[PDB]
Enzyme design. Sequence first.
Site, PDB file in Angstrom:
ATOM      1  CE1 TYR A  19      -5.764 -15.652  19.970  1.00  0.00           C
ATOM      2  CE2 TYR A  19      -7.024 -13.626  20.040  1.00  0.00           C
ATOM      3  CZ  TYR A  19      -6.852 -15.072  19.366  1.00  0.00           C
ATOM      4  OH  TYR A  19      -7.168 -15.071  18.324  1.00  0.00           O
TER       5      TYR A  19
ATOM      6  N   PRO B  49      -7.577  -0.902  18.404  1.00  0.00           N
ATOM      7  CG  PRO B  49      -6.385   1.198  19.523  1.00  0.00           C
ATOM      8  CD  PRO B  49      -6.213  -0.165  18.780  1.00  0.00           C
TER       9      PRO B  49
ATOM     10  CG  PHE C 275     -10.269  -4.104  24.811  1.00  0.00           C
ATOM     11  CD1 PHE C 275     -10.123  -3.551  23.609  1.00  0.00           C
ATOM     12  CD2 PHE C 275     -11.094  -3.252  25.811  1.00  0.00           C
ATOM     13  CE1 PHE C 275     -11.350  -2.450  22.949  1.00  0.00           C
ATOM     14  CE2 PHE C 275     -12.181  -2.264  25.696  1.00  0.00           C
ATOM     15  CZ  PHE C 275     -11.845  -1.936  24.174  1.00  0.00           C
TER      16      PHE C 275
ATOM     17  CG  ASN D 209     -13.461 -22.448  16.125  1.00  0.00           C
ATOM     18  OD1 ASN D 209     -14.602 -21.611  15.914  1.00  0.00           O
ATOM     19  ND2 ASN D 209     -12.793 -22.848  15.289  1.00  0.00           N
ATOM     20  N   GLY D 210     -12.275 -22.895  20.438  1.00  0.00           N
ATOM     21  CA  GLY D 210     -12.085 -23.587  21.533  1.00  0.00           C
ATOM     22  C   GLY D 210     -12.208 -22.709  22.836  1.00  0.00           C
TER      23      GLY D 210
ATOM     24  CD  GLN E 187     -34.715  -7.740  41.272  1.00  0.00           C
ATOM     25  OE1 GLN E 187     -33.757  -7.142  40.914  1.00  0.00           O
ATOM     26  NE2 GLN E 187     -35.851  -7.152  41.598  1.00  0.00           N
TER      27      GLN E 187
ATOM     28  CD  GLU F 227     -12.327 -15.786  24.469  1.00  0.00           C
ATOM     29  OE1 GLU F 227     -11.195 -16.113  25.182  1.00  0.00           O
ATOM     30  OE2 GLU F 227     -12.093 -16.722  23.515  1.00  0.00           O
TER      31      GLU F 227
HETATM   32  C1  LIG Z   1     -10.966 -12.702  25.814  1.00  0.00           C
HETATM   33  C2  LIG Z   1     -10.204 -12.651  24.559  1.00  0.00           C
HETATM   34  C3  LIG Z   1      -8.980 -13.506  24.719  1.00  0.00           C
HETATM   35  C4  LIG Z   1     -10.624 -12.007  23.378  1.00  0.00           C
HETATM   36  O1  LIG Z   1     -11.677 -11.115  23.499  1.00  0.00           O
HETATM   37  S1  LIG Z   1      -9.684 -12.122  22.038  1.00  0.00           S
HETATM   38  C5  LIG Z   1     -10.026 -11.155  20.468  1.00  0.00           C
HETATM   39  C6  LIG Z   1     -11.601 -11.736  20.084  1.00  0.00           C
HETATM   40  N1  LIG Z   1     -12.211 -11.234  18.790  1.00  0.00           N
HETATM   41  C7  LIG Z   1     -12.841 -11.905  18.186  1.00  0.00           C
HETATM   42  O2  LIG Z   1     -13.432 -13.246  18.473  1.00  0.00           O
HETATM   43  C8  LIG Z   1     -13.096 -11.434  16.700  1.00  0.00           C
HETATM   44  C9  LIG Z   1     -14.365 -11.388  16.197  1.00  0.00           C
HETATM   45  N2  LIG Z   1     -14.555 -11.578  14.617  1.00  0.00           N
HETATM   46  C10 LIG Z   1     -14.243 -12.864  13.989  1.00  0.00           C
HETATM   47  O3  LIG Z   1     -14.222 -14.031  14.747  1.00  0.00           O
HETATM   48  C11 LIG Z   1     -14.266 -12.737  12.627  1.00  0.00           C
HETATM   49  O4  LIG Z   1     -13.445 -11.450  12.333  1.00  0.00           O
HETATM   50  C12 LIG Z   1     -15.642 -12.763  11.889  1.00  0.00           C
HETATM   51  C13 LIG Z   1     -16.346 -11.270  11.989  1.00  0.00           C
HETATM   52  C14 LIG Z   1     -16.634 -13.849  12.225  1.00  0.00           C
HETATM   53  C15 LIG Z   1     -15.313 -12.930  10.338  1.00  0.00           C
HETATM   54  O5  LIG Z   1     -14.582 -11.830   9.612  1.00  0.00           O
HETATM   55  P1  LIG Z   1     -14.207 -11.900   8.112  1.00  0.00           P
HETATM   56  O6  LIG Z   1     -13.358 -10.631   7.697  1.00  0.00           O
HETATM   57  O7  LIG Z   1     -15.418 -11.665   7.389  1.00  0.00           O
HETATM   58  O8  LIG Z   1     -13.494 -12.990   7.408  1.00  0.00           O
HETATM   59  P2  LIG Z   1     -14.115 -14.402   6.906  1.00  0.00           P
HETATM   60  O9  LIG Z   1     -14.150 -14.235   5.290  1.00  0.00           O
HETATM   61  O10 LIG Z   1     -15.546 -14.764   7.577  1.00  0.00           O
HETATM   62  O11 LIG Z   1     -13.017 -15.449   7.350  1.00  0.00           O
HETATM   63  C16 LIG Z   1     -11.626 -15.454   6.773  1.00  0.00           C
HETATM   64  C17 LIG Z   1     -11.190 -17.026   6.852  1.00  0.00           C
HETATM   65  O12 LIG Z   1     -11.378 -17.557   8.292  1.00  0.00           O
HETATM   66  C18 LIG Z   1     -12.377 -18.562   8.446  1.00  0.00           C
HETATM   67  N3  LIG Z   1     -13.002 -18.599   9.680  1.00  0.00           N
HETATM   68  C19 LIG Z   1     -13.735 -17.518  10.288  1.00  0.00           C
HETATM   69  N4  LIG Z   1     -14.385 -17.690  11.360  1.00  0.00           N
HETATM   70  C20 LIG Z   1     -13.990 -19.078  11.766  1.00  0.00           C
HETATM   71  C21 LIG Z   1     -14.045 -20.153  12.757  1.00  0.00           C
HETATM   72  N5  LIG Z   1     -14.797 -19.753  13.980  1.00  0.00           N
HETATM   73  N6  LIG Z   1     -13.314 -21.360  12.717  1.00  0.00           N
HETATM   74  C22 LIG Z   1     -12.755 -21.775  11.829  1.00  0.00           C
HETATM   75  N7  LIG Z   1     -12.365 -20.937  10.507  1.00  0.00           N
HETATM   76  C23 LIG Z   1     -12.973 -19.569  10.647  1.00  0.00           C
HETATM   77  C24 LIG Z   1     -13.382 -18.807   7.166  1.00  0.00           C
HETATM   78  O13 LIG Z   1     -13.942 -19.666   6.961  1.00  0.00           O
HETATM   79  C25 LIG Z   1     -12.385 -18.083   6.109  1.00  0.00           C
HETATM   80  O14 LIG Z   1     -11.747 -18.991   5.156  1.00  0.00           O
HETATM   81  P3  LIG Z   1     -11.527 -19.122   3.734  1.00  0.00           P
HETATM   82  O15 LIG Z   1     -12.134 -17.819   3.356  1.00  0.00           O
HETATM   83  O16 LIG Z   1     -10.113 -19.017   3.675  1.00  0.00           O
HETATM   84  O17 LIG Z   1     -12.261 -20.305   3.471  1.00  0.00           O
HETATM   85  C1  LIG Z   2     -28.238   0.985  47.202  1.00  0.00           C
HETATM   86  C2  LIG Z   2     -29.099   0.657  48.160  1.00  0.00           C
HETATM   87  C3  LIG Z   2     -29.421   1.833  49.016  1.00  0.00           C
HETATM   88  C4  LIG Z   2     -30.614   1.852  49.961  1.00  0.00           C
HETATM   89  N1  LIG Z   2     -31.084   2.745  50.459  1.00  0.00           N
HETATM   90  C5  LIG Z   2     -32.068   2.743  51.598  1.00  0.00           C
HETATM   91  C6  LIG Z   2     -32.426   3.934  52.183  1.00  0.00           C
HETATM   92  O1  LIG Z   2     -31.815   4.840  52.229  1.00  0.00           O
HETATM   93  N2  LIG Z   2     -33.481   3.715  53.306  1.00  0.00           N
HETATM   94  C7  LIG Z   2     -33.754   2.349  53.582  1.00  0.00           C
HETATM   95  O2  LIG Z   2     -34.775   2.253  54.511  1.00  0.00           O
HETATM   96  N3  LIG Z   2     -33.692   1.411  52.926  1.00  0.00           N
HETATM   97  C8  LIG Z   2     -32.730   1.574  51.882  1.00  0.00           C
HETATM   98  N4  LIG Z   2     -32.395   0.378  51.080  1.00  0.00           N
HETATM   99  C9  LIG Z   2     -32.992  -1.021  51.306  1.00  0.00           C
HETATM  100  C10 LIG Z   2     -33.972  -1.609  50.294  1.00  0.00           C
HETATM  101  O3  LIG Z   2     -35.242  -0.761  50.825  1.00  0.00           O
HETATM  102  C11 LIG Z   2     -34.223  -2.937  50.485  1.00  0.00           C
HETATM  103  O4  LIG Z   2     -32.911  -3.398  50.280  1.00  0.00           O
HETATM  104  C12 LIG Z   2     -35.118  -3.341  49.581  1.00  0.00           C
HETATM  105  O5  LIG Z   2     -36.644  -2.896  50.115  1.00  0.00           O
HETATM  106  C13 LIG Z   2     -35.494  -5.266  49.836  1.00  0.00           C
HETATM  107  O6  LIG Z   2     -35.285  -5.665  50.912  1.00  0.00           O
HETATM  108  P1  LIG Z   2     -34.147  -6.985  51.194  1.00  0.00           P
HETATM  109  O7  LIG Z   2     -32.855  -6.522  50.732  1.00  0.00           O
HETATM  110  O8  LIG Z   2     -34.255  -7.308  52.643  1.00  0.00           O
HETATM  111  O9  LIG Z   2     -34.742  -7.939  50.170  1.00  0.00           O
HETATM  112  P2  LIG Z   2     -35.826  -9.192  50.434  1.00  0.00           P
HETATM  113  O10 LIG Z   2     -36.894  -8.452  51.180  1.00  0.00           O
HETATM  114  O11 LIG Z   2     -35.333 -10.144  51.499  1.00  0.00           O
HETATM  115  O12 LIG Z   2     -36.159  -9.817  49.167  1.00  0.00           O
HETATM  116  C14 LIG Z   2     -35.342 -10.395  48.188  1.00  0.00           C
HETATM  117  C15 LIG Z   2     -36.180 -11.021  47.091  1.00  0.00           C
HETATM  118  O13 LIG Z   2     -37.404 -11.489  47.526  1.00  0.00           O
HETATM  119  C16 LIG Z   2     -38.348 -10.640  46.823  1.00  0.00           C
HETATM  120  N5  LIG Z   2     -39.380 -10.754  47.671  1.00  0.00           N
HETATM  121  C17 LIG Z   2     -39.660 -10.560  48.965  1.00  0.00           C
HETATM  122  N6  LIG Z   2     -40.827 -10.686  49.306  1.00  0.00           N
HETATM  123  C18 LIG Z   2     -41.393 -11.412  48.320  1.00  0.00           C
HETATM  124  C19 LIG Z   2     -42.704 -11.718  48.261  1.00  0.00           C
HETATM  125  N7  LIG Z   2     -43.779 -11.770  49.357  1.00  0.00           N
HETATM  126  N8  LIG Z   2     -43.145 -12.410  47.289  1.00  0.00           N
HETATM  127  C20 LIG Z   2     -42.444 -12.462  46.020  1.00  0.00           C
HETATM  128  N9  LIG Z   2     -41.028 -11.855  46.174  1.00  0.00           N
HETATM  129  C21 LIG Z   2     -40.859 -11.513  47.285  1.00  0.00           C
HETATM  130  C22 LIG Z   2     -37.918  -9.316  46.593  1.00  0.00           C
HETATM  131  O14 LIG Z   2     -38.478  -8.891  45.661  1.00  0.00           O
HETATM  132  C23 LIG Z   2     -36.307  -9.791  46.332  1.00  0.00           C
HETATM  133  O15 LIG Z   2     -36.098 -10.126  44.846  1.00  0.00           O
HETATM  134  C24 LIG Z   2     -31.299   0.432  50.177  1.00  0.00           C
HETATM  135  C25 LIG Z   2     -30.721  -0.656  49.260  1.00  0.00           C
HETATM  136  C26 LIG Z   2     -29.877  -0.613  48.331  1.00  0.00           C
HETATM  137  C27 LIG Z   2     -29.128  -1.784  47.687  1.00  0.00           C
END
Ligand SMILES: C=C(C)C(=O)SCCNC(=O)CCNC(=O)[C@H](O)C(C)(C)COP(=O)(O)OP(=O)(O)OC[C@H]1O[C@@H](n2cnc3c(N)ncnc32)[C@H](O)[C@@H]1OP(=O)(O)O
Ligand SMILES: Cc1cc2nc3c(=O)[nH]c(=O)nc-3n(C[C@H](O)[C@H](O)[C@H](O)COP(=O)(O)OP(=O)(O)OC[C@H]3O[C@@H](n4cnc5c(N)ncnc54)[C@H](O)[C@@H]3O)c2cc1C
Lengths: 384, 384, 383, 384
Positions: free
Chosen positions: C126, C131, C159, C242-243, C339, C366
């Site tokens: 798509y 840019p 992208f 929308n979908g 976490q 999207e």
């Molecule tokens: C991972 C993937 C695949 C991707 O990322 S794909 C790229 C995704 N990018 C986006 O989603 C773009 C984000 N931007 C937008 O959707 C739109 O540009 C905005 C910002 C909501 C609106 O832009 P505007 O320039 O203000 O246009 P706007 O006047 O709102 O709309 C133009 C026409 O389209 C219609 N329209 C706008 N959004 C709509 C929607 N979601 N569903 C149905 N109709 C829509 C709107 O009602 C208007 O109709 P009309 O004036 O003929 O009644």
């Molecule tokens: C990038 C990186 C670098 C590191 N470098 C070093 C290093 O140089 N030297 C070293 O010694 N270690 C190092 N560590 C290890 C780090 O110290 C441990 O990962 C950290 O202390 C947590 O221990 P764990 O991973 O076993 O998690 P766990 O202790 O198993 O805990 C998991 C989760 O449970 C929570 N939790 C644990 N106990 C409780 C409790 N009683 N009550 C509520 N919540 C609790 C924790 O907060 C956490 O969210 C590193 C880790 C990373 C990811």
Amino acid sequence: TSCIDPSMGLNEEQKEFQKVAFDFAAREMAPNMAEWDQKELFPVDVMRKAAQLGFGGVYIQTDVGGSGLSRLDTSVIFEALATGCTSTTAYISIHNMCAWMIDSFGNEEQRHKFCPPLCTMEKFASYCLTEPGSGSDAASLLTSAKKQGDHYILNGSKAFISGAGESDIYVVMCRTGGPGPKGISCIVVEKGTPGLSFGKKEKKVGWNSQPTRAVIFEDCAVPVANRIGSEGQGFLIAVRGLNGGRINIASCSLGAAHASVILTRDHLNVRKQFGEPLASNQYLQFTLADMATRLVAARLMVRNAAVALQEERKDAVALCSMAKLFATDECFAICNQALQMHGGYGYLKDYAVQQYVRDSRVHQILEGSNEVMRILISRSLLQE
Amino acid sequence: TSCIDPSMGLNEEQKEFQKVAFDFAAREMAPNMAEWDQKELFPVDVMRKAAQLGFGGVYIQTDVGGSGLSRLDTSVIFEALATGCTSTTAYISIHNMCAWMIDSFGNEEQRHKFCPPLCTMEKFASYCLTEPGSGSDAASLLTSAKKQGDHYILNGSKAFISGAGESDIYVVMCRTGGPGPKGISCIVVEKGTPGLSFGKKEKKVGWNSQPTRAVIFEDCAVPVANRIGSEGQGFLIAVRGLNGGRINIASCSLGAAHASVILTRDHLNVRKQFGEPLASNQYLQFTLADMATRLVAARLMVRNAAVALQEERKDAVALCSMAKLFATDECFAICNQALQMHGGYGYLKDYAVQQYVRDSRVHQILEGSNEVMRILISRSLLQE
Amino acid sequence: SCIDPSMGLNEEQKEFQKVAFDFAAREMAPNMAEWDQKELFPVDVMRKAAQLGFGGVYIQTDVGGSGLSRLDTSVIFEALATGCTSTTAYISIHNMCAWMIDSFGNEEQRHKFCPPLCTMEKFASYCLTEPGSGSDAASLLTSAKKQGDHYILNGSKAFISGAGESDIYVVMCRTGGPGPKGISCIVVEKGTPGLSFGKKEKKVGWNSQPTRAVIFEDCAVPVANRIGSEGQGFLIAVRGLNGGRINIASCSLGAAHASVILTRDHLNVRKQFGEPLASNQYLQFTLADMATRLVAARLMVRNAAVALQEERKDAVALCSMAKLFATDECFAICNQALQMHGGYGYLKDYAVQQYVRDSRVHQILEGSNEVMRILISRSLLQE
Amino acid sequence: TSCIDPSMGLNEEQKEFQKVAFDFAAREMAPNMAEWDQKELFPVDVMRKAAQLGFGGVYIQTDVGGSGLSRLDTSVIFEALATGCTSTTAYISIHNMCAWMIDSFGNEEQRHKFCPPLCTMEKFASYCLTEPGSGSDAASLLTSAKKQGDHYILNGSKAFISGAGESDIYVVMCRTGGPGPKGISCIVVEKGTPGLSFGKKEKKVGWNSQPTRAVIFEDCAVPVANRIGSEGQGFLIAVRGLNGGRINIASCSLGAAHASVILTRDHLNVRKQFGEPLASNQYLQFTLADMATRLVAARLMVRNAAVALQEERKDAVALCSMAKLFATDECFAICNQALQMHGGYGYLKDYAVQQYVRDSRVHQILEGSNEVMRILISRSLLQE
Ligand SMILES: C=C(C)C(=O)SCCNC(=O)CCNC(=O)[C@H](O)C(C)(C)COP(=O)(O)OP(=O)(O)OC[C@H]1O[C@@H](n2cnc3c(N)ncnc32)[C@H](O)[C@@H]1OP(=O)(O)O
Ligand SMILES: Cc1cc2nc3c(=O)[nH]c(=O)nc-3n(C[C@H](O)[C@H](O)[C@H](O)COP(=O)(O)OP(=O)(O)OC[C@H]3O[C@@H](n4cnc5c(N)ncnc54)[C@H](O)[C@@H]3O)c2cc1C
Ligand SMILES: C=C(C)C(=O)SCCNC(=O)CCNC(=O)[C@H](O)C(C)(C)COP(=O)(O)OP(=O)(O)OC[C@H]1O[C@@H](n2cnc3c(N)ncnc32)[C@H](O)[C@@H]1OP(=O)(O)O
Ligand SMILES: Cc1cc2nc3c(=O)[nH]c(=O)nc-3n(C[C@H](O)[C@H](O)[C@H](O)COP(=O)(O)OP(=O)(O)OC[C@H]3O[C@@H](n4cnc5c(N)ncnc54)[C@H](O)[C@@H]3O)c2cc1C
Ligand SMILES: Cc1cc2nc3c(=O)[nH]c(=O)nc-3n(C[C@H](O)[C@H](O)[C@H](O)COP(=O)(O)OP(=O)(O)OC[C@H]3O[C@@H](n4cnc5c(N)ncnc54)[C@H](O)[C@@H]3O)c2cc1C
Ligand SMILES: Cc1cc2nc3c(=O)[nH]c(=O)nc-3n(C[C@H](O)[C@H](O)[C@H](O)COP(=O)(O)OP(=O)(O)OC[C@H]3O[C@@H](n4cnc5c(N)ncnc54)[C@H](O)[C@@H]3O)c2cc1C
């Protein structure tokens, strides 16, 4: 003054640190972020250049090669570096924590042996705590370290280790005693030691610039002289490392979010649809206002926690958890909204926003997942 | 140190102000809150006691009876007072703003005439800006002030005026010139002036301790000597008042939320269901953790904005808007969650949480609705 | 089960659902990770799906389609999405293309293009976005100038899903004046001189579908390839969407359902703190929320599908509401599921992260969810 | 056809029921809603007019005076009535639930003695389950019923009883046996019975047209012949009754939200600020779109659950819980947003939106809190 000015409140020295880090990120990291992520490359060369500026041992003592900066200084630096590459900055933070553990708890011999090469990143470090059966319940780790003569014999496996395979120094939390936190010790294991192997490189959603693999020990003999601190001090060292880790991972989230807000603001002003800039649409203006407001709130939270920690306040530990919880949640949301603002382009790897999203997402799981943060925070509040 | 300690970061003087305000609120306001709300009573006697402590003109110059405190000092005070009665504290803030406009923009004769009685609350003030046709679009006000000799003849009506009927001094924004912001002037109108009347006492969801009435002007002759500032300075005065208004209303929200978190924490620990305290339920623990985390974030935001404003920083206006937006939104959510945590009891007027909810709800609409806050914030960021 | 996807469906639809799910579990799920990692367009598997009647689900039977309803289609895509959301989404796009030709083309066109598409002997793309025209789709610049019995196309699309692999391109081009009224729909076939493609875009998800720019340089296309009358192109485009939106929403439903099931089982088996993760009330409550929102999203999508098939006057608005609601809610569900898996949820070995990455884009493409609000609000405020 | 048309999908009979209900609400309820709320008046005369239309026993068997309609027919009727007054309609639903419990589980003597008067509302009923120490944990109730001859002697108290004091028939869940659900029985207590008294009339945020009082039993002798069902079947009867009650409360929320959306749509089109209708602002347009979308989703969830319950499907209990959870949460948010859209006017009692907000807020707590709903839902999910 910008309403999201990242320099407001900082002293002159910190503004300089910030400038240096940001400049480095823009010059050495941003241009390469996409490639490192796509090819899953561990940027050794760039990280070593970062270390030359003092980012290899940001808050490590200067006598062992560190920069000797504060918690707030560090947060400011990682936040700035994260705008270049959040994944790489996060690893740099983990590396720094490993060096900090040795620097802060090791003896003089250990400090001068391991820290210098880590600070220059001649060698890289990995933190080994997590295991297949112990994640959030970290203190239930099973890796054992049996003392025999002048060595510890390690047996077990660690999971998700960042930098594994590439790192030469591994800070390993193992069980030397009984069950629970008290039976855990911290031992340094060097790459090349017989009995130490690695699992496959894990494929992940983000944090791709750092290899992720299991670390396995099979009757791995390690010198007792490699134990950091005394036996049973392992979980204390881990828990203290977590305070800084929570601040720093949150700081990485701040950087990703700040970069995302800036990119978003510029994009809204430049990209046109329906004959006008996207910025002409009120819904988008409001979303941006929310992003900026929450970024400022997140920044205040992280910096507030950093100051509390460096000042040794009694509420510091709870504040670090609150900051990590709040910032990683809010910043991921900011980056994700920024992605939405870019439309289809935000989904393409050619645009940085999607990596800030992918990298910042995991911050909500690490350094104690946000669920764990709530356990800790609620426990503290209900106990008073 | 509590993870939600409201004194952390304040200087010694501020901690004292806070203690005085809180003790006053607990002793004179909290025990009467429910009654003032139910009977819709304007608490004249208690407010005058508050003024005796210096809360009648918190940030008004001391030469005219004020306390001469800063923006942050004021935020701390209103936050503490709001824990007693958010509605009444909000009115006190409005009264304070009126006194501030006269103190800051009036000539010496006006300052020494109107400010002293307002600071002791011998007289109460009301701010008159909103009209049936001008709410968010405040600069489109229609109330006219036609110069005639040495008087201005006022015609028009104001809406939602807090304190109307009870107040002796009305700070009225009227149109002395052409259309738009530039044709507005600020004029003081005193109760008793022929041609001044009031509408019915409006029934509302909250803010019941302060009467809400329309203020009507029918060929109301007011001395030109009552004009605050120059002709056309009205817009500027209202806008400068809004910066402080945003900080102070957000501060009232902070108080309601803090009170709600404390009530919730205690309730969860005391109330038992299924044989255990409600606090034993993890979902409730997590919700409390969220509430506390966001309260701390809101507090940082408000205080950060107050400091920026008093320091006259270029980012102050934006920060006040961000703080008001963030705090009023987060704090209402906190109070509403607190209500949920109390179960059916939270819906009963015998429990304070429901009034914190009803009172804090309107803060998201006043001093520039949160939609307007987003307009202001996005505008600022997009022009950067 | 409180999330039983068969509840409310008739006997026939339950059978369609079973066939679709079994196919996804057997032919898609086992390969999802590989297609995503290697960015492979699963031609053989999609052709197997077409053999079951999924190549032209709601296309008329006289041209090879299955002639099913919008609701039947939603049920089928939701089931297929549990296997691979990315691939199923493409199948939906391919189906939309076939539907536009089937519903608006003349008999010669219907019997020429639709049959190969229904068996997927040929694939379709798509082509609307450019840019300079995304949300503002009616502002497209690709021109189509008539010259004898051919249109000369010039412009480029961005992208395009399936570009390069597809043989049939449903292209929206400008044949007349500005705006919606000057647009026409034209089928362009692969191999036509003047038609080229841009590089294969690197993306966060939807990796099983190639994404490339489609470029036209003095591309001569038969006037006989125009679907509908000149100027009816935008109407055909939106009618198709929308979908398409109902179906993209259906893909989100599948990703979310799979995520909820994975999370439920994970919480019951993974143990931490000596108990299954399911013993933690916050996780129990979060799962409850996920399931509740999933049921709500499913009801919304199926409700819109019925309205669209019945051609109700509220159908356009409902399709927009369904797409908005379901894509938002389902992404959130998948992200929460991630976490719940902890660190494992961040690994490519676990399906949850792909449901997150794939469903995330459904809120953008999207017709973005911001655009959905435009459509919904216009309808509400006009009455 | 509107995108929020409430008649879409309904059969011809249901559209007529809906029309009759809506016209009644618009003529007899809407005009008096504000007054009943302000004066806390129990609208006996109007409710009796509603009963004349067959709303006193909507889903009660026809042989005892009921209308014999389905769960879906009932949902449609309550949703329509709620647009007039959500508070009053909610009570009508509770009354209906009481009548249904007697009709469905009582013997023929009880059915024909109690149900007819309830269907014409000659008599009003109250559901009595909750106690000070048993709310969410309803099966832990303490009210005892000790058999003495052919009478039960009741001792204990119930809390939050809707209609208490005004009702003639009280359906009371009491403990006749051991602990837990199995020791509970259902017994009808008539007004005027010695030993039965009522507490003060509770002041509440909403549901003001309903008197709320504690129901106290002090050696209250009640005929054993008044027990509905067998001893120990009380809790089963209570919950079976609540499955339908929950669908109906959710239906009341739908009505409040639908009325709020219509009011907002019209308001945005008529109210002008900045020289244009409020509807010209994209943020408000988008917010209205969200409100309508969520309303349609909530409507589908409630009607889906009603069909499942009427067909006695195995998934009915879970669906009713999901519908109540989803609809009460979404609908309160819709009404609260509608309040914001009205600005300051939305906070005034002269505008209906604020009562829809106050009334719908409690639906998230009563008839089984939304936290309880999550317990029921998660149990089902994790068990299968
Ligand atoms: C991972 C993937 C695949 C991707 O990322 S794909 C790229 C995704 N990018 C986006 O989603 C773009 C984000 N931007 C937008 O959707 C739109 O540009 C905005 C910002 C909501 C609106 O832009 P505007 O320039 O203000 O246009 P706007 O006047 O709102 O709309 C133009 C026409 O389209 C219609 N329209 C706008 N959004 C709509 C929607 N979601 N569903 C149905 N109709 C829509 C709107 O009602 C208007 O109709 P009309 O004036 O003929 O009644
Ligand atoms: C990038 C990186 C670098 C590191 N470098 C070093 C290093 O140089 N030297 C070293 O010694 N270690 C190092 N560590 C290890 C780090 O110290 C441990 O990962 C950290 O202390 C947590 O221990 P764990 O991973 O076993 O998690 P766990 O202790 O198993 O805990 C998991 C989760 O449970 C929570 N939790 C644990 N106990 C409780 C409790 N009683 N009550 C509520 N919540 C609790 C924790 O907060 C956490 O969210 C590193 C880790 C990373 C990811
Ligand atoms: C405005 C008004 C009128 C009001 O507010 S009225 C008062 C409303 N209060 C409530 O709704 C109470 C909220 N609490 C409850 O519904 C229940 O106490 C809970 C919390 C869900 C369950 O409580 P528990 O003590 O765990 O009992 P539990 O074991 O689940 O159930 C007891 C029996 O009832 C059954 N049951 C429970 N909920 C049921 C439901 N919704 N439908 C059908 N059966 C149900 C259950 O299956 C069990 O049967 P058995 O074990 O014999 O198979
Ligand atoms: C309890 C209470 C006390 C008050 N006390 C005072 C007082 O003492 N003195 C005084 O002067 N006033 C007072 N007010 C009035 C208050 O300032 C106004 O109610 C408020 O500014 C909003 O104006 P409005 O009510 O006309 O709503 P509107 O301005 O009509 O706005 C309605 C809705 O539209 C939104 N909106 C408006 N314009 C836009 C736009 N361009 N884009 C997007 N959204 C928009 C608003 O945010 C809001 O949600 C009080 C109000 C209340 C409820
Ligand atoms: C993986 C993928 C596959 C795709 N496949 C196809 C395909 O096969 N065929 C095809 O034709 N297209 C395809 N697209 C493109 C898709 O349709 C567009 O990306 C989408 O419509 C948005 O257009 P845009 O990217 O130009 O963003 P923009 O239109 O520039 O919009 C950017 C942001 O602004 C918002 N916005 C835009 N206008 C307004 C407004 N008036 N008011 C408020 N907010 C607004 C958007 O919602 C979005 O958040 C694909 C995209 C992706 C990512
Ligand atoms: C206006 C009104 C009218 C009412 N009318 C009636 C009536 O007519 N008849 C009647 O019998 N009752 C009636 N009720 C009472 C109502 O049923 C209860 O208020 C409600 O069931 C909650 O019980 P509770 O108030 O004791 O709160 P609690 O049960 O104490 O619960 C407090 C909070 O904790 C949560 N919670 C409780 N247990 C758990 C758990 N295990 N896990 C997680 N969270 C949990 C709750 O959801 C809630 O948020 C009425 C209440 C109101 C406000």
